[PDB]
Design a protein around this ligand. Structure first.
Ligand SMILES: Nc1ncnc2c1ncn2[C@@H]1O[C@H](COP(=O)(O)OP(=O)(O)OP(O)(O)=S)[C@@H](O)[C@H]1O
Ligand SMILES: [Mn+2]
Length: 268
């Protein structure tokens, strides 16, 4: 895989592999800065499907300026000994994604989890302000730096993180992001997503039919007040969940600070 492509970026160590890309720590030679480069895998690149899937999700990833949002810098596709390799250049986050944490460290401590997801609401909310719906909220798209800073990425453009309105092919709004962010919060508190199945279609059915089991019913140490917040964000009807990311944050802040949520009590 490439030592130095674009003649502008010198790719370094692999920071990690995602479902369809290797992410390198490159060095921007022109602006003299450390940067992250997400390159489509060479094996998946000789497959027009993935090539186009990456190429689409590359020019469509929103570039926003926010301390909690990963800034996109460049996009392109250089010729390498493996054909073209589409790539996206972005802010280097020294840390891991929530997925990495869930599958290595395990379930986060409630207060820390509440903080992380509260900080993600800040980014989601700012995005909503600019009229941009993320519509792809999941653990692998939310990062935590070495300085505990929350960095969210891939705005614009995942089987068990989609909203009932997404699973029905309907429209998508701020409330849709709330539901998905709620799924991330659920998993990060308990250890597993709200809904799991033997096939994507199974999970999609569970999303728009089956109710979520209270987080505390799945993991030890989770307050009932936390159930209220989580489960409200997982409400099937958009009008039942939080209307804005700020609203959800306002409620996480309360639970965090040992205050009663404005979310309907989870009873029986
Ligand atoms: N902006 C970044 N800065 C530093 N490291 C990153 C950055 N983005 C991703 N990484 C690392 O690369 C790994 C994979 O990144 P992903 O975004 O999950 O790749 P992906 O192919 O888009 O996977 P998906 O989103 O599930 S399709 C992560 O676990 C991180 O360690
Ligand atoms: Mn991705």
């Amino acid at each position: 895989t490439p030592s130095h492509l674009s003649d502008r970026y010198e790719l370094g160590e692999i920071l990690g592999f995602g479902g369809m890309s290797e992410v390198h720590l490159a060095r921007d030679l022109r602006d003299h800065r450390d940067v992250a480069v997400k390159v489509l895998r060479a094996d998946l690149a000789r497959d027009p499907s993935f090539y186009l899937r990456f190429r689409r999700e590359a020019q469509n990833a929103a570039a926003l300026n926010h301390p909690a949002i990963v800034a996109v810098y460049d996009t392109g596709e250089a010729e390498t000994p493996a054909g073209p390799l589409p790539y996206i250049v972005m802010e280097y986050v020294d840390g891991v994604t929530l997925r990495d944490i869930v599958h290595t460290e395990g379930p986060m401590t409630p207060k820390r989890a509440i903080e992380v997801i509260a900080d993600a609401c800040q980014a989601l909310n700012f995005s909503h302000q600019n009229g941009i719906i993320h519509r792809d909220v999941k653990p692998a798209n939310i990062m935590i730096s070495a300085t505990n800073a929350v960095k969210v990425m891939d705005f614009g453009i995942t089987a068990q993180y989609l909203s009932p309105e997404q699973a029905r092919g309907d429209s998508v709004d701020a409330r849709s992001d709330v539901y998905s962010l709620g799924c991330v919060l659920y998993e990060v508190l308990t250890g597993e997503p709200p809904f799991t199945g033997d096939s994507p279609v199974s999970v999609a059915y569970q999303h728009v039919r089956e109710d979520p089991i209270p987080p505390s019913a799945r993991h030890e140490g989770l307050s009932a007040d936390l159930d209220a917040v989580v489960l409200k964000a997982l409400a099937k009807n958009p009008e039942n969940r939080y209307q804005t990311a700020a609203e959800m944050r306002a409620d996480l802040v309360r639970v965090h600070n040992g205050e009663p949520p404005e979310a309907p009590k989870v009873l029986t």
